[PDB]
Design an enzyme around this catalytic site. Structure first.
Site, PDB file in Angstrom:
ATOM      1  N   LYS A 191      51.919  46.948  30.262  1.00 37.94           N
ATOM      2  CA  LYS A 191      50.709  46.080  30.943  1.00 37.94           C
ATOM      3  C   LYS A 191      50.684  46.027  32.394  1.00 37.94           C
ATOM      4  CE  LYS A 191      47.686  41.952  30.736  1.00 37.94           C
ATOM      5  NZ  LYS A 191      46.720  42.817  31.318  1.00 37.94           N
ATOM      6  N   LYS A 250      49.807  50.755  34.850  1.00 41.25           N
ATOM      7  CA  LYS A 250      48.632  50.596  35.798  1.00 41.25           C
ATOM      8  C   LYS A 250      47.631  51.920  35.242  1.00 41.25           C
ATOM      9  CE  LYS A 250      48.094  48.454  39.393  1.00 41.25           C
ATOM     10  NZ  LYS A 250      48.286  46.776  39.035  1.00 41.25           N
ATOM     11  N   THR A 303      48.186  33.409  40.434  1.00 38.94           N
ATOM     12  CA  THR A 303      48.746  33.732  41.316  1.00 38.94           C
ATOM     13  C   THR A 303      49.221  32.613  42.090  1.00 38.94           C
ATOM     14  OG1 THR A 303      47.880  35.864  40.533  1.00 38.94           O
ATOM     15  CG2 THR A 303      49.260  35.543  42.435  1.00 38.94           C
ATOM     16  N   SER A 333      47.772  36.682  32.376  1.00 37.68           N
ATOM     17  CA  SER A 333      47.203  37.762  31.905  1.00 37.68           C
ATOM     18  C   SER A 333      47.814  37.994  30.814  1.00 37.68           C
ATOM     19  CB  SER A 333      47.989  39.156  32.941  1.00 37.68           C
ATOM     20  OG  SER A 333      47.110  38.908  33.749  1.00 37.68           O
TER      21      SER A 333
END
Ligand SMILES: NC(=O)c1ccc[n+]([C@@H]2O[C@H](COP(=O)([O-])OP(=O)(O)OC[C@H]3O[C@@H](n4cnc5c(N)ncnc54)[C@H](O)[C@@H]3O)[C@@H](O)[C@H]2O)c1
Ligand SMILES: NC(=O)c1ccc[n+]([C@@H]2O[C@H](COP(=O)([O-])OP(=O)(O)OC[C@H]3O[C@@H](n4cnc5c(N)ncnc54)[C@H](O)[C@@H]3O)[C@@H](O)[C@H]2O)c1
Lengths: 410, 410, 304
Positions: free
Chosen positions: C66, C102, C186, C238
Site C-alpha cells: 500500500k 510506492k 492526517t 486509506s
C-alpha cells in the site's frame, strides 16, 4: 551409523579399561543365544501372514536376562542384538541380578487390529517359550507394546506352563501382578540424578538457572518438577522453537497452553532457536528432546555446569569428551533413565515372593538404587579420570565380566 | 464398531426424523468429493519419501467446506470422510455458511524435522490446491498441526495464487491474519452453554452447585470459571480419585497443587470415588473427562439438574435416553464444543473483509452464536419431544438438506 | 543525505534492537519487487512522449502492499524504494494488514494538460497492472496526484478487469467508492497524538528534528512524538476505504472518526510502551513497532 557394531565398541572400550583380556571381549561382543522365529498368524480377513520375530540373550552370567519386546517395521537382527547388550549395561549400572535381553517382531502394529496383535503376541510366546521364563529371560514392554500385550503374552506363557507365571514378563497390569509405581519410575529417576548431580557441584536448585529441551512427556514433567523446587526455568523448547526468560519462565502458563502433542512455541511471536536455547548460560541443561543435540559443533558453546540427559543419545561421542574436559558434569542417559529397569526388577521380585509393595515402598526402594548407582558411576568417573559415560559403561559391564570369569567361561 | 459407518448412521437417523427421502441420505452419506494425493518430500538425509494425503469435502450446498488437517500415523480415508461429515453437523448446529470438510496425512510428525514438516505442508497444499481455497474449502489446525503449519500452508497457497489469501486457512498467527479471542474458544463455549442451560432451568449460577469430572486442560479451566462466577464447585476429580466439599472446594488452591498430568487427588487421600463424584446432588454436572462415565448403571442415580458434556462421548446412548426421561437438561458435546469452529469462522470473515476484531468483540459474537445454537437445539428437542443429542444432529444436518433440495441436487 | 541509505539504516537499527539477525535485514533492506516501466503517451500536439514509471512493493509478508503515486520531475528509483519502506513502517505502527508500497512517474504535471495527465495515468495502470490490484498492491494519491487521478486509474484498471474494482486504489471520489472522513484524516491524526500526549513535542510529518536533537530532548525527559506515528491518519483512512471496498458497504464520517481515534490511540500506547520499557527515544521505538509485524511474518511464512 550401524548400532550393533557401535555397541560392540562400547563394550570393547569398557572391558579394555577395566583390564579384562581379549577373550572376554570375544565372549561379550555377541549374544550367547539369538533365536530367530517365523510366526504364522491368522489375520482378520482369513489369510495367514507370517511374521519374523527375534529374541536375543546377551549374557546370563549374572542371572536371567531382561529386556523388552518391540513391534516395529524397522526391527532388525542387529537392532535386537545391540539392545540386548545395552540392557546388560543398564541392569549392571543399577546392580541388578540380570543380564541383558531383547526381542522384536517385524510388523506394523498400527496397521493391525486388536485380535491380530493378540494372536501375534501369543504366537511370539509360543515360538520362543523354550528359552524364556521367570528363571531364564524376562521380556517387558517397549516400542508399540504395552500392558495389554504383556497381559496376552503372560496368559499364553501360563497356559503352556499349566500354572500362573506372572514373573515371566514385566509391565503387567496391576491385577496380573504388575508393580505399583511403574509409570513414573523413569522420570523420577531423572529427578534423583538431577538432585544428586546438583549436590556434587553444590548448586542449590532453588534459584538455580535451568533450561530444558523439549516439552512433551519427559519435558513437561521436568519443567514442572524444577519450577516447584523453586528453580528458575529460564528456557524451554519445542520442535518449532524455544522460549527464554532470564527471570524464569512461567512454567504453569506454558503447561496450561500446551497442546496434546508437546508443542507450545507456536502460540508465541518472540521466539529463540533451539540452537540458542542449548547455548544459554545456566546451571543445569537438561536435553529432553531428541538425539545428537550437543555435537562437536556446539560442545564448546554450551555453558552449563550440569548436563543430565533425559533424551536418549542427545550428546555425540566427540561432544562428550569436549564436555568433560570443560569441567562439566555430564550424567549419561543410560544412568539417568535406569529407573524403568529398576522398577521392572522390583516387579519381578514381587512376582517371586507373591507379595506386593505399596507405592511409597517402591519409591523408597527406587530412590536408593538411583542414589547408589549415581554414586557408583560418579566415583568411577572421578577415581579413573574418565567421562561419566565410559565410567557408566564400565560399571555396566564389570559384573558380567566378573561373573563370566568366576563361572569358568574365560 | 467403525466410525465412518457409525457416522453414516447418525446422518441417516437425523434426516429420517426431519422427514427427507432416501435420496437425501444417498447424497449425504458420502462426501461429494474425496481427494487422495501422493506427496513426495525431500528428507534431510537427501532421500525422497512419498506420503499419502486426503482431503474430504462432505457437502458444499451451504457454502465452502470447512475442516482441519491432521498429521497422524493412524489417519485413514474413512476417518477423514467421517470427520468431514461431523464438521457439516457442527457447522450446522452453530449456523455457519459452511459445509463439512477435513484432511489428513499419514505421517509420524514425531520422526520428522521442522524442515521435513514444512516441505510436507507445502507439498500438501500443492497437491490439493485445485479444489481448496478461500471460497471453496478452508482448512485449519488439528492433531499435530498448529499455527506454524497453518502459516506454511497459507504461504504456499498465497505463492500459488500470486497474492495473499489469508482466508484460505484458519488458525493462522495473528501477524498473518488469525483471529483474536481464539485460544480458549472451545472452553469459553462450554462456559456459555452452562450459563444458558442454567437460565433455562431458572438456576442462579452465582450460588449453584457445580460438579466437574476431570481436572486437566478443560476441567481446570471450567472449575476456575465456575468458581469466579460465584458458583460453588463442590466436586472435582482426576484419574486417581475425587474431592468433595459441600460448600465449595477452593479451586485456586487446587490449581496450585496440580502436577502437570492434571492430578491433584493424590495429595489429599481424604478422597471420594469417581462413581460417587458423579452421583452427588448438584445443579450442574460437567463430565470433562474420558468417555462412558454416564451409563445405564450410572444415569438413574445422577442427581444434577443439568449435564453438560465437556468431553466427547461421556454419556452412552442408553444413558442419554434415561437423563431425557428423568427431565435432566443434557447439552451434547457436539454442541457445547462448537466455540472452536465458531471462532474459526470469525477468522475467515475477518479475512474476507480485511478487517480485524478486538478480543472483546470476538467474545460478544461468540456468546450470541453459542446462545443461539443452544436455543435452537433446545427448541428442536422440546418441540419434537426428543433428546437433545438427536436434536443437535438434526439442527446440524437441516441446513445442508434444505440447501441440497433448494439447489436441485435431489 | 540519500533518503534510501538513510532509511536502510533506520530498518537496520530497529531490526537489530528487536533481536533478529542479519538475514532479516537482508530480506527487508530492499523491496521484494521493483518494477520500472516506460509509458508512451500521445500529447496534445499529436507527438509521442515516453515516460518512466516505478512501482515498489517493499514486502507483502503481512498482506498486500500500500502506498501512493507521485508525479514529479525529481521522482527517482531510490526515492520510490525508500518511501515504500516508510510505508511498511507507517502501516506497522497503525497495525494495518498491509506491507509497504510506492510508485512514481518522472513528469511535470503542471506543464501537462488534463487530457495528457489522464492518458499518462491510464498508461501507468496498463504498464504495471500485472503486479497491482485490490489483493496485491493498492496505490493512492501523493505529490501532484489527487482524486481525479485516482478515478482515471481506477477506471483503467476496471476496464482491464471487465468489472469495477474500487478496491484497487484509494483516494477515490465518494461516488466511486471513496471514504468519508478522508480530507481531515492526517490532521486528525496529529490532533489525537496530541491528546494522548497529555497523560511534550509532536512532529510536523516532514522530518523536522535531527538525530542529536531527539537525543537531547529525550535525555531531558521531554516526550517526543515522531512524524512516522503522528502523520499516520492518512494511511489509516486509506485502509478504511479499502475495507469498505472489500465489503461493498460504506461508513458515515461519524464511524470513520470513531475508528480513526481508536487506531491512533492504540498506536500511541504501543510506541509509548516501547520507548518507556526499553528506555529509548520514541522515534526508534516507532521504527520498531513499524517493522516488527513484517519481520515476524517473514519468519512465520518461511522466508528467512
Ligand atoms: N522420562 C524420561 O526422562 C524419558 C523416558 C524415556 C525416554 N525419554 C527420551 O526423551 C525424549 C522425549 O521423550 P518424550 O516422551 O518426552 O517425547 P514426546 O514426543 O512426548 O515429546 C518430545 C518433545 O521434543 C520436541 N522435539 C522434537 N524434535 C525436536 C527437535 N528437533 N528439537 C527440539 N525439540 C524437539 C517435541 O516437539 C516435544 O516437545 C526422547 O529422546 C526419549 O527417548 C525420556
Ligand atoms: N493425542 C490424542 O490422540 C488425543 C486424543 C483425544 C483428545 N486429545 C486432546 O487432548 C485434550 C484433552 O483435554 P482434557 O481437558 O481432557 O485434558 P487432559 O487429557 O490433559 O486431562 C484430563 C483429565 O481427566 C482425568 N481423568 C482421566 N481418566 C479419568 C477418570 N476415569 N475419571 C476421572 N478423571 C479422569 C485426568 O487425570 C485429567 O485430570 C484436548 O485438546 C483433546 O483434543 C488428544
Amino acid at each position: 551409523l550401524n548400532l550393533f557394531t557401535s555397541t560392540q565398541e562400547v563394550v570393547k572400550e569398557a572391558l579394555n579399561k577395566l583390564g579384562y583380556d581379549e577373550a572376554m571381549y570375544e565372549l561379550l561382543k555377541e549374544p550367547l543365544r539369538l533365536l530367530k522365529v517365523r510366526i504364522p498368524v491368522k489375520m482378520d480377513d482369513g489369510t495367514t501372514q507370517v511374521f519374523t520375530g527375534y529374541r536375543a540373550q546377551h549374557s546370563d552370567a549374572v542371572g536371567p536376562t531382561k529386556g523388552g519386546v518391540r513391534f516395529h517395521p524397522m526391527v532388525s537382527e542387529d537392532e535386537v542384538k545391540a539392545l540386548s547388550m545395552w540392557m546388560t549395561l543398564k541392569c549392571g549400572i543399577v546392580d541388578l541380578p540380570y543380564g541383558g535381553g531383547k526381542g522384536g517382531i517385524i510388523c506394523d502394529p498400527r496397521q493391525m487390529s486388536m485380535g491380530e496383535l493378540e494372536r501375534l503376541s501369543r504366537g511370539y510366546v509360543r515360538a520362543i517359550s523354550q528359552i524364556v521364563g521367570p528363571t531364564k529371560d524376562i521380556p517387558g514392554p517397549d516400542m508399540f507394546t504395552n500392558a495389554q500385550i504383556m497381559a496376552w503374552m503372560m496368559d499364553e506363557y501360563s497356559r503352556m506352563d499349566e500354572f500362573n507365571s506372572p514373573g515371566f514378563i514385566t509391565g503387567k497390569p496391576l491385577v496380573l501382578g504388575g508393580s505399583k509405581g511403574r509409570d513414573r519410575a523413569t522420570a523420577e529417576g531423572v529427578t534423583i540424578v538431577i538432585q544428586e548431580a546438583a549436590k556434587k557441584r553444590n548448586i542449590d536448585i532453588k534459584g538455580a538457572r535451568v533450561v530444558i529441551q523439549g516439552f512433551g512427556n519427559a519435558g513437561s514433567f521436568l519443567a514442572k518438577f524444577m519450577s516447584d523446587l523453586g528453580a528458575k526455568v529460564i528456557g524451554i523448547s519445542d520442535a518449532y522453537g524455544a522460549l527464554h526468560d532470564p527471570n524464569g519462565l512461567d512454567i504453569d502458563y506454558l503447561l496450561d497452553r500446551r497442546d496434546s502433542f508437546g508443542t507450545v512455541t507456536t502460540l508465541f511471536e518472540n521466539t529463540i532457536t533451539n540452537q540458542e536455547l542449548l547455548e544459554l548460560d545456566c546451571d543445569i541443561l537438561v536435553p529432553a528432546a531428541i538425539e545428537n543435540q550437543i555435537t562437536a559443533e556446539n560442545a564448546h558453546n554450551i555453558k552449563a555446569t550440569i548436563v543430565v540427559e533425559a533424551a536418549n543419545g542427545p550428546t555425540t561421542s566427540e561432544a562428550t569428551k569436549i564436555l568433560t574436559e570443560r569441567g562439566i558434569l555430564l550424567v549419561p542417559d543410560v544412568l539417568a533413565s535406569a529407573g524403568g529397569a529398576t522398577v521392572s526388577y522390583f516387579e519381578w521380585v514381587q512376582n517371586n515372593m507373591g507379595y506386593y509393595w505399596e507405592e511409597e515402598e517402591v519409591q523408597e526402594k527406587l530412590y536408593k538404587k538411583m542414589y547408589d548407582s549415581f554414586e557408583a558411576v560418579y566415583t568411577t568417573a572421578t577415581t579413573r579420570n574418565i567421562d561419566m559415560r565410559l565410567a557408566a559403561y564400565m560399571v555396566g559391564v564389570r559384573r558380567t565380566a566378573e561373573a563370566s570369569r568366576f563361572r569358568g567361561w574365560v
